[PDB]
């Protein structure tokens, strides 16, 4: 699905861009967290997005590749787990997600 792409592609974005700098953190934290229906209970690294690719979508979780770098230049791969659902028309990320192979 198409929309689900376009929104999802925002959250995994913001999730594997946070910066370096402490202050804009805590606004990204806020960014990244705008993407819930919930607010998490109190971890991410600095990183840059390189590539992302939707694989598979199964009932209510998204599964994307993701290609991203830490500044510690190694690229990191994974599959990256994002559950999801919709309220009046407009998506949202139901939990945190979860890493895979």
Known sequence: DYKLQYYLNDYVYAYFTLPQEGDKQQAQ??????????????????STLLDSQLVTVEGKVA???????????????????????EKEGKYYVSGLPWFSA
């Open 63 to 85: 599964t994307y590749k993701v290609k991203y770098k830490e500044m510690i230049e190694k690229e990191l791969v994974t599959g990256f787990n994002i559950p999801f659902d």
């Open 29 to 46: 934290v806020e960014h990244l967290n705008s993407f819930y229906n919930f607010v998490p209970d109190v971890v991410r690294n600095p």
